[PDB]
């Protein structure tokens, strides 16, 4: 069986902010919050992923206040807290879930200082997390059908001849959002779950389920809540339409992040 | 007879190359062992000899044909057949030396090179690094003919080593990485030849370490960062499997889940 390590790491999420023990106070019950990612050895942003499914900062446990949607997440002594309230699973699609409650770690607002909570899982941007020491999103070109490049043009998105154009650069944030490099307040967005809905660029404000994406091992870019993938409509770039569409795997649904 | 997958450079397209690489992956591993959504090749421990290898038959415009043999446990080329002669890289140990005796049994001439099939020795024998050996349909065509004529006295050793470097990347590495496969599809799509950029080189160099970091990660988070390179020289670190899911398609087996 493989060794299970215990790496110390930051947890980056909504709008690229870091999971933070507020004001560096480790009193039992002090809230966990979003905060700009530090670049030092401060303990309140460095988390040990322990073998017992515990996530620890300065020796104390990331702990949910309860098992109902909307209760806050605190720091608490690992031995004193209810054991089930200290246990978490980090899923490969960016979800951090509390197994006992089946509720998911969330930042229901995007501002610095937002109190973290547990919410019902809807695979929204507000519930996307990444354990990493990288505090900057990865900027990349996204190549797709016929080797053409995903291109941002204000609200509209389409695929067009690649040319090393800031309109063709994309910031992959730790919360699962895909942001145009020129304006990181905005997000690749599907306004809804319906098949053939046109994907566009809108504000990352709502941090919705339509704004969260995962690059799958099969080359598709998946919207987790709907289960639909990005698709160059009719496999015709001239339509200038990128849509949500059920998975069929043909070349108009294959993408590659060329970093 | 071991499973055979065929590819021809004659009229090769993006699609025909994709079908080929997909087919190779389907015979390299069953796909039932998946760690963090990334397939794992079979464990060498427990793998019977009659399932140890797969065959990749390459042909070109001149209808020269050559058959590479791939170890399914690491997707790497261990040797090749051309006509009624077969050649093999110097095996690392005695068991791999025994295992290749089960390849191309019908062939009347069998030879083991004094050199292994690692890039470092192939590069010095070719007189050039991967960073300058162009890849694409054209180079694959020429690599096929050079491999074919090595039985004849017509292929000098550097050209042979260069042909190995071409086939290994365009077949084995593309099987290991969707990223490298997409790089090959870029060359085929535009009928261009191009040396691989540093991102491809570092991915090839890191494949073993990446497999270990992923399979021994704590829920995807690595114990230590792995340093990769962008397409320009720029270096960055990876701490989590999430960015590698669309990058790596196969891993060498390291340990049990």
């Amino acid at each position: 069986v493989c060794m299970d390590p215990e790496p110390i790491v930051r947890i980056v999420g909504r709008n690229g902010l870091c999971v933070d023990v507020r004001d560096g106070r480790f009193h039992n019950g002090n809230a966990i919050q979003l905060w700009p990612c530090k670049s030092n050895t401060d303990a309140n942003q460095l988390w040990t992923l322990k073998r017992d499914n515990t996530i620890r900062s300065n020796g104390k446990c990331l702990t949910t206040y309860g098992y109902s949607p909307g209760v806050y997440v605190m720091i608490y002594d690992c031995n004193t807290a209810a054991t089930d309230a200290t246990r978490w699973q980090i899923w490969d699609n960016g979800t951090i879930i509390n197994p006992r409650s089946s509720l998911v770690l969330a930042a229901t607002s995007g501002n610095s200082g937002t109190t973290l909570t547990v919410q019902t899982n809807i695979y929204a941007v507000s519930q996307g997390w990444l354990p990493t020491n990288n505090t900057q999103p990865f900027v990349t070109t996204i190549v797709g059908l016929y080797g053409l490049c995903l291109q941002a043009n204000s609200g509209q998105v389409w695929i067009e001849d690649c040319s090393s154009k800031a309109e063709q650069q994309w910031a992959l944030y730790a919360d699962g959002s895909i942001r145009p490099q020129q304006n990181r307040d905005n997000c690749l967005t599907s306004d809804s779950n319906i098949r053939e809905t046109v994907v566009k660029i809108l504000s990352c404000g709502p941090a919705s389920s339509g704004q969260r994406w995962m690059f799958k091992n099969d080359g598709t870019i998946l919207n987790l809540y709907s289960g639909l993938v990005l698709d160059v409509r009719a496999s015709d770039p001239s339509l200038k339409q990128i849509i949500l569409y059920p998975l069929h795997g043909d070349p108009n649904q294959i993408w590659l992040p060329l970093f | 007879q071991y499973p055979i997958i065929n590819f021809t450079t004659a009229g090769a397209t993006v699609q025909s190359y994709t079908n080929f690489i997909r087919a190779v992956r389907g015979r390299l591993t069953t796909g039932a062992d998946v760690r963090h959504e990334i397939p794992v090749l079979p464990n060498r421990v427990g793998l019977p000899i009659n399932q140890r290898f797969i065959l990749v038959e390459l042909s070109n415009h001149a209808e020269l044909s050559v058959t590479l043999a791939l170890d399914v446990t690491n997707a790497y080329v261990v040797g090749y057949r051309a006509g009624n002669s077969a050649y093999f890289f110097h095996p690392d140990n005695q068991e791999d030396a025994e295992a290749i005796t089960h390849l191309f049994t019908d062939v009347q001439n069998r030879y083991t090179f004094a050199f292994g099939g690692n890039y470092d020795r192939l590069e010095q024998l070719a007189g050039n690094l991967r960073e300058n050996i162009e890849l694409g349909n054209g180079p694959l065509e020429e690599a096929i003919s050079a491999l074919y004529y090595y039985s004849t006295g017509g292929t000098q050793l550097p050209t042979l080593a260069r042909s190995f470097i071409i086939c290994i990347q365009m077949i084995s590495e593309a099987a290991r990485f969707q990223y490298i496969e997409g790089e090959m599809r870029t060359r085929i799509r535009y009928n261009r030849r191009s040396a691989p950029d540093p991102s491809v080189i570092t991915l090839e160099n890191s494949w073993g370490r990446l497999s270990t970091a992923i399979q021994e990660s704590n829920q995807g988070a690595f114990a230590s960062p792995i340093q990769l390179q962008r397409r320009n020289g720029s270096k960055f670190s990876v701490y989590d499997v999430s960015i590698l899911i669309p990058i790596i398609a196969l891993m060498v087996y390291r340990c049990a889940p």
Epitope: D161, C162, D236, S238, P251 | V14
Partner: nanobody
């Protein structure tokens, strides 16, 4: 290369258009300015219809015969136009990909 065929009938009728290709690698679509009507991916498996014609038109393909179809049921005077076949492919151009058209077939309803 692509050539159309099968292009008059009253409102509410039926007509099937064919599209014979010379050379499966190609996504194919129908157009009728030129406007998108229907499209299908190379292997099939993805069919995408314009909103106007959805629920009335059926695009199909058959890559062992190299022919593309457009079934047009419940036609209206709104469908009267020149109907072109179109294909998109992987090669090099100013687009960055290939676009081959047809010569067009007239339909009047």
């Amino acid at each position: 290369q692509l050539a159309e065929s099968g292009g008059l009938v009253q409102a509410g009728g039926s007509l099937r258009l064919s599209c014979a290709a010379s050379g499966s690698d190609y996504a194919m679509g129908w157009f009728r300015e030129r406007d998108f009507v229907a499209g299908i991916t190379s292997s099939g498996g993805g069919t995408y219809y314009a909103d106007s014609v959805k629920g009335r038109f059926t695009i199909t393909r058959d890559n062992y015969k190299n022919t593309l179809y457009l079934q047009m049921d419940s036609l209206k005077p709104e469908d009267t136009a020149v109907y072109y076949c179109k294909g998109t492919a992987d090669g090099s151009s100013s687009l960055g990909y290939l676009e081959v058209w047809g010569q067009g077939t007239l339909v009047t309803v």
